[PDB]
């Protein structure tokens, strides 16, 4: 109970603004009606601007706190499951048995992709990145399922959403099979979300595939730990695009392209340049590449994060899980013993203590996925597939907020009006 | 110029906030430091927040001003052609014949889209709304043009700019042909941007196509007049997707989607419901449909605009253009006197006169396109097609400044930390 | 001597020479040149084998791929012991290689295939099948 009362802006006279309080975190200065006075604020990046009111996820960056509907991430990641967590993100409360069982049913009954989309896939190159294919197929879902782009309709919205949750995994796994030259696999209504995904990832006609319980459980936790992560650039992209009334799918497709932007946006050799110098200077079995590489550090390799100060709250369960899996797959992850050395380097090497490059969740998610046998390129794909339930929670929370259309101002500092006279002829 | 120096915010401690000035329009308050100082504003919609500093387009609705690099849209539309406006917008200056030739040659050098991409077209169902195919195809480009994705690399942004610049008319032309069942037409070097597009949309292998000089200018004008329109919704999404790393091809695809969101987002019968009541109550040759339809008015029909107060500056030269076209297509443009009648209604009806439902640019564009055999399914494709340069420029500008990633705040109002204990057992 | 042949002759005549053992009289040359021209276009179904190879394929792997599948399409000229058959094959393979090689390149780069032009020399036709597009006329530099 401090300045929870008001505040004032003085250009050359006073102006009183409210200061709405939140249930957690910082309270905000309401400046909604300023525009109608000409008074504008300037904030590229919006890091001092609350772009919305939300009740989905809460994060105290410094306290390494991650809450989803109030439920501690580590509590959900340990005692829940992907769908139950999906239900909590989309519904705000843990489900009853009837509510959950109903939800589940609906999700398994629409996990197939129109036979006509199978053809789209084929029009892509086999050497295409599984993420690009992933964006291409999602950005094209509007040309087919054209019975739910009416954003202002809770029926359409609720359907559009349910289709994404059901189909994303089928889609994600199909990028993989196409990327390796194996036939696509149809979901199994008998398996779990996670077990079903692993089957579509690795099932082959040659014989029945049996999923490992520890592996099945591990993947479900990878998803849980990726289901949502507040107002980041990708969610903000899904939010802004949606503010204009862009159909559900197009908004989900932008969230994906946005999610891996830091990857390709780096450069043909950003965190790759030194992944090539592991041949000429491989005299030292570690500092040769992924230990001398990062000249321009990356949280994309699993070290650090802008959101958290000392640690990732998602890395707790993922690391514990990472032990059970390496332990399980045993004599297949003996070589992947560099995991403890990179973890060692990050923890002790002064360069990592200095830049606070702590192993985040994607460090151990990467370890588990490599153990399971999933190619590197398929990581942000699975990451995006998991985050889509969150993107839907936000995009939907946005469509209930009166849906204010993102119409920002700009500090214009260009040419004042001037007549135009062309000096060409072509 | 009274307080273009400083001002103060007062919550519990006075904060010194510098006032930034623009060369045209309102001023701004640099608040990029409140955030850190534990102070966040609250502006859902960003209507009171400048999202960036720009030099591209200045608007002044109240007075109907629109400048592209200081030049009034009127002169640009009359004294220039679309290609030069592209150069101007992109570089900030008009081109010397040499720069124009060089710019025009580069564009011409990248018109043909990769043939495999042309195989993605045969995967979409024929019935697809062309605009759903455009988001589909544009979002799949990154998979084919994978070498121009280092958004942080200056040479890469340029290659993309031209790739997307050169190929949009090609792809848009294909979207139309595809939907109607005619063979695709390749880019013709000896044809202007506007004439080439008319040629790619309407010619066939059965007879030579005569590019009428009149329509060719009306098209160009349609194109210049839809080049850019400052920080509107779709352009805001562009910069937002791009600031989060996203590749250029994906940004435009997102922009494209945000652009036609209000099209299908109205309802399966938003401005369509009454397009069906033109059969039972067609006793009155006008007020039956598109004169009794708008119960929930639409600027998408070409009436009114949230930006300009009394008139759409772009529509002046467009109304003139509209006149010549109708005066050319002679005895094929007679029935189209409902345009003459509709305008009269938007001018002399109390409702319209009251809520200022003045005919905007798309009103006259539409009639020109409608008078050109062009289908309403293609109206958006052309607008978006043309608007692409405006997006590329804004995207390029955002990078030069530093690509400040989008990380807005939120006002958390959900649950407080609560314990989770699974309510289900399945 | 290879020197004279390269300077005083063109590829097509060298083909005749090599195949028959003698240089051609203008009449034999015309007749030989016309037959070749008569078999340049490859069957369209074969052109559908090209879209099965991945775009990334090293063109030379596609050439062995396509050439080894010809027998399936041109099944009537396979009696190697029959003299008339060897001749039909000779010209089939003779006429169509530049066509297929041109396609191998276009395919790998994503541009549309270009058909054989009768009014073009063997060498000029090949330059034309490799580099021209439907967007502008191509000038075969002499």
What is the domain range of residue B166? 50-266+376-412
Same domain, B125 and B223: yes
Determine phi and psi for A158, rounding to 5 degrees: -65, -35
What is the number of helices (H) and of strands (E) in chain A?
A: 16, 10
How many other C-beta atoms are found inside a 10 Å radius of the C-beta of residue A158?
Answer: 15
Is residue A420 situated within a structural domain? no
Q: Look up tokens 């896939």; give the residue.
A: A121
Closest Cβ–Cβ partner in C110, C135, C136 for B115: C110
Same domain, B151 and B291: no
Q: How many folded domains does chain A comprise? A: 3
Three-class SS of residue B19? strand
Question: Rounded to the nearest 10 degrees, how much is the dihedral formed by the CA atoms of A405, A410, A414, A418?
Answer: 50
Distance (Å) from the C-alpha of residue C104 to the closest C-alpha of chain A? Answer: 17
Tell me which chains share at least 3 CB pairs under 8 Å with chain B. A, C
How many other C-beta atoms are found inside a 10 Å radius of the C-beta of residue A350?
Answer: 7
Closest Cβ–Cβ partner in A47, A125, A257 for B407: A47
Task: For residues A111 and A133, give the distance between their C-alpha atoms in angstroms, rounded to a whole number.
Answer: 19
Beta-carbon separation of A50 and B124 below 8 A: no
Q: Specify the DSSP class assigned to residue B113.
A: P
Among all residues of chain B, which has the CA nearest to that of C136? B189
* List of chain A residues whose C-beta atoms are within 8 Å of the C-beta of residue C109: none
CATH number at residue A16: 2.20.28.60
Nearest C-alpha neighbor of A92 from the set C84, B415, C105 = B415
Beta-carbon separation of A240 and B236 below 8 A: yes
PDB experimental method: X-ray
Is residue A141 situated within a structural domain? yes
Among all residues of chain C, which has the CA nearest to that of A179? C54
Among all residues of chain A, which has the CA nearest to that of C55? A125
Is residue B421 situated within a structural domain? no
Task: For residues A317 and A362, give the distance between their C-alpha atoms in angstroms, rounded to a whole number.
Answer: 12
Q: Look up tokens 């200045």; give the residue.
A: B58
How many beta-carbon pairs under 8 angstroms link B with C?
Answer: 23
* List of chain B residues whose C-beta atoms are within 8 Å of the C-beta of residue C134: 186
Distance (Å) from the C-alpha of residue C105 to the closest C-alpha of chain B? Answer: 13
Three-class SS of residue B166? helix
* List of chain A residues whose C-beta atoms are within 8 Å of the C-beta of residue B246: 237, 254, 257-258, 261, 265
Termini Cα distance of chain B: 68
Closest Cβ–Cβ partner in C51, C55, C133 for B112: C133
Task: For residues A137 and A118, give the distance between their C-alpha atoms in angstroms, rounded to a whole number.
Answer: 10
Closest Cβ–Cβ partner in C110, C135, C136 for B116: C110
Same domain, B80 and B157: yes
Same domain, A185 and A251: yes
- Find the helix packing angle between A213-224 and A315-328, rounded to 10°: 160
CATH number at residue B394: 1.10.580.10
Among all residues of chain B, which has the CA nearest to that of C106? B115
Last residue of a domain, one of A34, A49, A64: A49
Determine phi and psi for A146, rounding to 5 degrees: -90, 30
Q: Specify the DSSP class assigned to residue B335.
A: S
Is residue B133 situated within a structural domain? yes
Beta-carbon separation of C112 and B116 below 8 A: no
* List of chain B residues whose C-beta atoms are within 8 Å of the C-beta of residue A419: 71-72, 75
How many other C-beta atoms are found inside a 10 Å radius of the C-beta of residue A410?
Answer: 27
Beta-carbon separation of C111 and B112 below 8 A: yes
Question: Rounded to the nearest 10 degrees, how much is the dihedral formed by the CA atoms of A338, A342, A348, A351?
Answer: 140
CA max distance for chain C: 47
Nearest C-alpha neighbor of B360 from the set B304, B320, B318, B309 = B304
Tell me which chains share at least 3 CB pairs under 8 Å with chain C. A, B
Quote the radius of gyration of chain B (alpha carbons, Å): 24
Instruction: Encode A9-45: b = buried (16+ Cβ within 10 Å), e = exposed.
Output: bebeeebebbbeebebbbbbbbbbebbeeebbbbbbb
Reported residue count of chain B is: 426
Nearest C-alpha neighbor of A25 from the set A67, A71, A76 = A67
CB A236 within 8 A of CB B409: no
Same domain, B131 and B260: yes
Is residue B115 situated within a structural domain? yes
Three-class SS of residue B148? coil
How many other C-beta atoms are found inside a 10 Å radius of the C-beta of residue A153?
Answer: 16
Among chain A, residues having any CB pair with chain C shorter than 8 Å are 125-127
Last residue of a domain, one of A330, A352, A375: A375
Provide CB contacts within 8 A for A323, sequence distance 6+: none
Determine which of B108, B112, B191 to mutate to test the interface with C (most C C-beta atoms within 10 Å).
Answer: B112
Alpha helices in A39-142 (DSSP H): 73-79, 82-91, 97-108, 115-122, 130-139
Determine which of A100, A414, A418 to mutate to test the interface with B (most B C-beta atoms within 10 Å).
Answer: A414
Task: Report which secondary-structure segment, H or E, holds A367.
Answer: helix A361-372
Task: For residues A184 and A96, give the distance between their C-alpha atoms in angstroms, rounded to a whole number.
Answer: 35
Is residue B26 situated within a structural domain? yes
Task: For residues B152 and B248, give the distance between their C-alpha atoms in angstroms, rounded to a whole number.
Answer: 11
Same domain, A205 and A120: yes
Task: For residues A294 and A274, give the distance between their C-alpha atoms in angstroms, rounded to a whole number.
Answer: 8
Nearest C-alpha neighbor of A385 from the set A126, A148, A164, A87 = A164
Same domain, A330 and A380: no
Give me A42's structure tokens.
């300037």
Nearest C-alpha neighbor of A385 from the set A199, A201, A172 = A172
Beta-carbon separation of C111 and B116 below 8 A: no
- State how beta strands B28-30 and B14-20 pair: antiparallel
Task: Report which secondary-structure segment, H or E, holds B384.
Answer: helix B379-401
Beta-carbon separation of B189 and C111 below 8 A: no
Among chain C, residues having any CB pair with chain B shorter than 8 Å are 51, 55, 110-112, 133-136
Task: For residues A192 and B61, give the distance between their C-alpha atoms in angstroms, rounded to a whole number.
Answer: 56
Distance (Å) from the C-alpha of residue B423 to the closest C-alpha of chain A? Answer: 6
Is residue A10 situated within a structural domain? yes
Task: For residues A127 and A272, give the distance between their C-alpha atoms in angstroms, rounded to a whole number.
Answer: 18
Same domain, B364 and B382: no
Among all residues of chain A, which has the CA nearest to that of C51? A123
Same domain, A246 and A168: yes
Task: For residues A91 and A360, give the distance between their C-alpha atoms in angstroms, rounded to a whole number.
Answer: 28
Instruction: Encode A198-213: b = buried (16+ Cβ within 10 Å), e = exposed.
Output: bbbbbbeeeeeeebee
Residues of B identified as active-site: 305, 362
Task: For residues B410 and A49, give the distance between their C-alpha atoms in angstroms, rounded to a whole number.
Answer: 8
Same domain, B232 and B136: yes
Task: For residues B25 and B60, give the distance between their C-alpha atoms in angstroms, rounded to a whole number.
Answer: 7
* List of chain A residues whose C-beta atoms are within 8 Å of the C-beta of residue C54: 125-127
B267 burial type by CB count under 10 A (0-12 exposed, 13-18 middle, 19+ buried): middle
Is residue B258 situated within a structural domain? yes
Same domain, B18 and B79: no
Provide CB contacts within 8 A for B223, sequence distance 6+: B82, B193, B194, B382, B386
Distances (CA, A) of B56 to A416, B85, B225, B389: 11, 12, 15, 11
Task: Report which secondary-structure segment, H or E, holds B41.
Answer: strand B41-42
* List of chain A residues whose C-beta atoms are within 8 Å of the C-beta of residue C55: 125, 127
Among all residues of chain A, which has the CA nearest to that of B66? A417
Same domain, A71 and A191: yes
Closest Cβ–Cβ partner in C51, C110, C135 for B187: C135
């Amino acid at each position: 109970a401090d300045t929870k009362a008001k505040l004032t802006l003085n250009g050359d006279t006073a102006v009183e603004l409210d200061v709405l309080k939140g249930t957690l975190g910082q309270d905000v200065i309401d400046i909604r009606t300023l525009g109608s006075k000409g008074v504008f604020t300037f904030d590229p990046g919006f890091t001092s601007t609350a772009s919305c009111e939300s009740k989905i996820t809460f994060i105290d960056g410094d306290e390494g706190i991650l809450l989803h509907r109030g439920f501690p991430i580590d509590q959900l990641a340990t005692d829940s499951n992907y769908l139950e967590v999906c239900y909590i993100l989309l519904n705000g409360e843990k489900p009853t048995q009837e509510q959950y069982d109903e939800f589940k049913t609906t999700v398994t009954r629409h996990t197939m992709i129109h036979e006509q989309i199978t053809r789209l896939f084929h029009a892509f190159r086999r050497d295409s990145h599984p993420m690009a294919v992933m964006c291409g197929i999602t950005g094209a879902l509007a040309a087919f399922y054209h019975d739910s782009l009416d954003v202002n309709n809770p029926r359409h919205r609720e359907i559009a959403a349910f289709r994404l949750l059901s189909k994303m995994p089928t889609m994600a796994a199909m990028c993989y099979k196409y990327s390796i030259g194996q036939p696509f696999v149809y979901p199994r209504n008998d398996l779990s979300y996670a077990g079903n995904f692993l089957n579509m990832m690795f099932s082959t006609p040659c014989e029945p595939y049996e999923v490992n319980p520890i592996l099945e459980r591990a993947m479900d936790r990878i998803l849980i730990l990726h289901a949502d992560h507040e107002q980041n650039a990708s969610t903000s992209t899904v939010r802004t695009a949606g503010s204009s009334g862009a159909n559900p799918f197009a908004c989900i497709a932008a969230g994906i392209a946005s999610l891996w932007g830091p990857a390709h946006g780096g450069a043909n050799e950003a965190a790759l340049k030194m992944l090539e110098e592991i041949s000429s200077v491989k005299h030292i079995p570690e500092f040769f590449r992924r230990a001398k590489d990062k000249n321009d550090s990356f949280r994309l390799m699993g070290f650090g994060h802008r959101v958290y100060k000392n640690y990732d709250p998602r890395a707790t369960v993922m690391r514990e899980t990472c032990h059970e899996v390496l332990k399980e797959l045993g004599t297949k992850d003996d070589l992947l013993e560099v995991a403890m050395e990179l973890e060692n380097i990050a923890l002790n090497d002064p360069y990592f203590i200095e830049k606070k490059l702590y192993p985040n969740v994607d460090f151990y998610s990467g370890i588990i996925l490599k153990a399971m046998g999933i190619p590197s390129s398929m990581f942000t794909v699975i990451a995006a597939m998991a985050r889509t339930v969150g993107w839907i929670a936000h995009w939907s929370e946005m469509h209930s907020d009166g849906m204010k259309i993102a119409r920002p101002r700009q500090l214009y500092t260009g040419y004042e009006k001037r007549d135009f006279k062309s000096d060409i002829k072509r």
